[PDB]
């Protein structure tokens, strides 16, 4: 589990998300693995606005922060996970890491913010769900 609080959003796999984040959904999409709802508390994370492809990852399942090179973000084939069977996932990032399905939600950060959120696992590879792009975020 685990979500980014910036301004009055919460950011959350979609496929974790609860009934109040449907209740106060803003922005979903299933491809990605996100859903974003509106929050009455402000938030104080800052999302990263840069393309670094090295930062720190928390690792619920290891209760430890992880450093990590990881891939641009992509179109990548997400294999038979609980959460997802056999099926495509974009602006997904690839590293070499331990990822469980209860480690889901564990931020990966950089110097300049928020990356992202663990989405995938097994096989000795974390999947990321790239938030950086959603611009929107940081406004509104
Ligand atoms: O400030 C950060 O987020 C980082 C600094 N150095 C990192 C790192 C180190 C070794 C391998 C991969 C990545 S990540
Ligand atoms: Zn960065």
């Not at 998300?17 to 709802?37: G, I, K, P, Q």
């Amino acid at each position: 589990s685990g979500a980014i609080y910036v301004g009055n959003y919460r950011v959350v796999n979609r496929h974790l998300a609860t009934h109040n984040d449907w209740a106060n959904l803003v922005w979903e999409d299933s491809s990605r693995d996100l859903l974003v709802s509106s929050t009455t508390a402000q938030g104080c994370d800052t999302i990263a606005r840069c393309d670094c492809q090295t930062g720190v990852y928390y690792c619920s399942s290891r209760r430890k922060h992880y450093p990590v090179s990881f891939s641009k973000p992509s179109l990548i084939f997400v294999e038979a996970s609980e959460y997802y069977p056999a099926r495509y996932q974009s602006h997904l990032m690839l590293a070499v890491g331990h990822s469980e399905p209860g480690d889901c939600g564990g931020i990966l950060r950089c110097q300049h913010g928020v990356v992202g959120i663990v989405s995938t696992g097994g096989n000795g590879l974390v999947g990321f769900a790239d938030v950086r792009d959603l611009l929107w975020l940081d406004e509104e």
